[model samples]
Target: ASTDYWQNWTDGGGIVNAVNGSGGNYSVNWSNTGNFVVGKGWTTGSPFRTINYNAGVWAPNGNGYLTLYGWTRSPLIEYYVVDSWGTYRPTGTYKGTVKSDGGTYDIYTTTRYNAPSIDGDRTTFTQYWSVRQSKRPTGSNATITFTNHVNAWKSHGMNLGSNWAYQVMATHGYQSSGSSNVTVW
Candidate 1:
């Protein structure tokens, strides 16, 4: 079995790729001309515990974010732990706040209807977000207590549901025209 995984996906336009390293550790760099996401992490991050990532030179020019990202099934969910972002940050109907991993993260819940997702096409799902109130310092390792956020989200009514899906620290370019490089361990 492979120790690591890489995914560079774009629906609109752009470019991304996995760089070096493997196992539960690796790196990825991405520059998006349009919407794109690139990440390197374990293929099966199930039973995943706490993990740390170095926000290496995470300078996003615009409309970008560096986040701990994942999905879930049996009710289907997409989740993000956004530690850093670019000129624009995603906002939705405010749910509440979660104090974890050394800072307070504002919680938000948004619904997307009939959208392409990991499960299949034309699927509706809930997106859970924990965006750091204060931007993280670049070039520093941030330790994310994975379960802590999960539990906290649950308390705030953002349950992850029954089964797990791919979990990775990903760089997202929504409106494009930005770049990021990150290391996960």
Candidate 2:
């Protein structure tokens, strides 16, 4: 039988993963902040769009997950578990790799300046890791590549240590399949 899924709504408890606020005055509140994953978005407005959440806070140029409170708009958002992490800006690109005893994973670095905004071209980027938990023993070879766009750049890599994965799993409750490590030049 599989392990019982515990659903708690406390700090570092029920919510397996969390993304802290950056250098802005942005904040998040979860009306039903229990048992939620990544890739999902949340809002209270009829359509929702006050803020946009990604998997990473900044350090890495990877796509993070989305979170939600409870009872928001008709289409509640969800956390989107990313595959890797890195840093990206608006002029360069980067790459990284993740290694595991079983195998490895890949992560690419790309950036978007002032994304979804109209201020100074929205020059901004981020670096983040992924979260995953499984019951089966799978391969662990990982890799990552970053491609710069006309308005963004990226730099990132993959993590191949068990400690990183284990730490996140133990604290968050959810298991991570892999991670990407990176640095911008």
Candidate 3:
């Protein structure tokens, strides 16, 4: 009776099956209007959660912005924003302790990033974050580091563009996880 698992949903409309200590199956769906939904046991409706990105609009360097949002079943959740450029970092009064290398922040709440901000970034990058509800494994502090690459791009006058890779591990102390990815222009 394993009760742990991981499920992923992309922008494309389809289901890609993979297993992770499964107890039951899950399904995910994405809509063109930026609505994300997850269903357990492959059934529709009940026992599902919807993540609406309607409030996550783009913004300039100043004026503030919203990047991601969601609800979590666990007691602890973390948020992150990563890229090869130096312009993106967490903003606002959320006061989640931030770790550099790729701007990771931890927020201990059930809902997260309803009004996230990436202060300034002239180029587009695949910014993402994850939420982990359970306690993290002992002595494990993971992060996505790409400072050298970002610095290298800066030296070459490259903005790192919209095509870059990064990962946001669950916070320093959590296990159960969920994540979201979006391109910030």
Candidate 4:
């Protein structure tokens, strides 16, 4: 609860927390008035793994999403595999959609120069996004197969950092009124 999976919130007036649940799984919940990111998964980044989770949220205002969010080191990257969203879905340098895990995810890249980062105040890092073109239905347990996305990104030279920080079934709310209840295993 304290380290395995964690929380990150900035300038928000809402609650975010994770708690141990039954059957070796956990629960994560968050509500935000500002930027908030929270999730349940492994830190120190595991490779060739999959995540099983079910999530639903109410963020009827601004842009927010449910993603597989995490960070990597070698190249200092923040990455996302977005499955569901609110308001508007985002677009970037618009890489074509990559199919995996029985879904098609639109790929893209955006650079964040001198922005707040997991490494704390780093300069010029890349953000790789694989946002699902369709939505993952609410109240359904879904599977994300990591190998497919990983290899696909590599094929495009969208190289993921070798050193991973954490890979979580993350939920975000950026300056929006939102709440999420997620169960992860």
TM-score of each model, in listed order: 0.87, 0.21, 0.22, 0.85
Top candidate (TM-score): 1
- The whole-model C-alpha lDDT of candidate 2 against the native structure comes to 0.23
Q: lDDT by residue for model 4 over 1-185, one digit each (tens)? A: 23366555454466556455553244445555666776777777665877787774434456778788888998888888888888878768876678877789988889878767776764788888888888768677788887777777787779877787878887777666555676666
User: Deviation in angstroms for 78 in model 1?
Assistant: 0.4
Q: What lDDT does the true structure give each of the candidates?
A: 0.73, 0.23, 0.25, 0.72
Better of 2 and 4 by lDDT: 4
lDDT of 1 by residue, 86-139 (tens): 887777768788777788888888999987788667879999888898887868
Q: After best superposition, candidate 2 residue 139: deviation in angstroms?
A: 16
The TM-score of candidate 1 is 0.87
Lowest lDDT block of 10, candidate 1:
22-31
Q: Which stretches in model 3 have alpha-carbon errors above 4 Å? A: 1-6, 10-31, 37-92, 102-185
Q: Rank the candidates by lDDT, best first.
A: 1, 4, 3, 2
Q: Model 3, range 76-114, lDDT digits (tens) per residue? A: 222233221112333333323334333443422123334
Kindly provide the TM-score of model 2 when superposed on the true structure, using C-alpha atoms: 0.21
